[PDB]
Amino acid sequence: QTDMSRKAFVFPKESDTSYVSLKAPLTKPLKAFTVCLHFYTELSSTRGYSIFSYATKRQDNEILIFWSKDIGYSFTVGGSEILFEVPEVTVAPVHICTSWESASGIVEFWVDGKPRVRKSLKKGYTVGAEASIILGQEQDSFGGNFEGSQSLVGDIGNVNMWDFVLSPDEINTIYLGGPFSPNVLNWRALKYEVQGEVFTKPQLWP
């Protein structure tokens, strides 16, 4: 494991080969989880891009958070999708924490600490454990088929994922930088495999 603290990956030029591969020790399939991350880019006023790509062998889009141009944040699980519309786009680092639970289908979406209304998805579904997680490319196959129009140019960090829903308090602690313990993906014990033009630098965001 390598401590990524106070550091971030940089994707300086749009391309279809620069990507980072993450490795999950996960064994049991997930009924629930909470993804939290911090990303920065100016592409908003331009084509769409993929923030986080989770793909099992039987579905390229098990979980994909995606910014859709003029639309906003697009969350999808198990092949379904819902859109969290955004009226106007600013230009600044943004933190986002999203939860989904298989029992109730409730999805929570916290942007910069401010929660969006809860909605429903795929009640009763289950997520396989054996998967590939990639940063900087939307994969339409298990480990390839990265399209150039969808790659991310910019910065990403603090990537963290649990196997259960955090309470609002815990999310507030995370957004404020307090101590916590990831159990499926730890930024502080991360294990990865870089590919192409990606570098490691100090984080810009506070």
């Epitope: 889009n61 994909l64 995606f66 639309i71 999808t76 379904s80 999708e81 939307e138």
Partner: nanobody, 125 residues
Framework: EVQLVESGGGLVQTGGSLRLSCAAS????????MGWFRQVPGKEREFVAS????????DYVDSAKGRFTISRDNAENTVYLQMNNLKPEDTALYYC???????????????????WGQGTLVTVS
């Protein structure tokens, strides 16, 4: 609320290709999912495919997968259905429909759909 029109139909020999297109009149087009349905004389309409609003999630019928492709261009707000290796049975009317001003997954029924186009004819010789 959009108004749907279709084009690209006609007759072709087996093994050909057809890039059918559908145009939408309105400004909320990007807020509606799209779909292609099939109809034959002496029967009702039949699900063919569908396209995501954002344009990242699709759904094909069992016969259409591997042979047909569906895409959408939001800027020009037009839906494209490219079919290849056409078969004689694949000769009927086709309708481009779509109706979820809101946000949800891709269904495969008819009640949810609300708006329909005039239709087009496709024939395989």
């Amino acid at each position: 609320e959009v108004q749907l029109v279709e084009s690209g139909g006609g007759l072709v020999q087996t093994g050909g290709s057809l890039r059918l297109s559908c145009a939408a009149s309105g400004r909320t087009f990007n807020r509606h999912y799209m779909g292609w349905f099939r109809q034959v004389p002496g029967k009702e309409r039949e699900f063919v495919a569908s396209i995501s609003q954002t344009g990242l999630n699709k759904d094909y019928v069992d016969s259409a997968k591997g042979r047909f492709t569906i895409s959408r261009d939001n800027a020009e707000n037009t839906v494209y259905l490219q079919m290849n290796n056409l078969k004689p049975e694949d000769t009927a009317l086709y309708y481009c429909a779509g109706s979820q001003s809101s946000y949800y997954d891709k269904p495969r029924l008819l009640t949810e759909y609300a708006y329909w186009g005039q239709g087009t004819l496709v024939t395989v010789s």
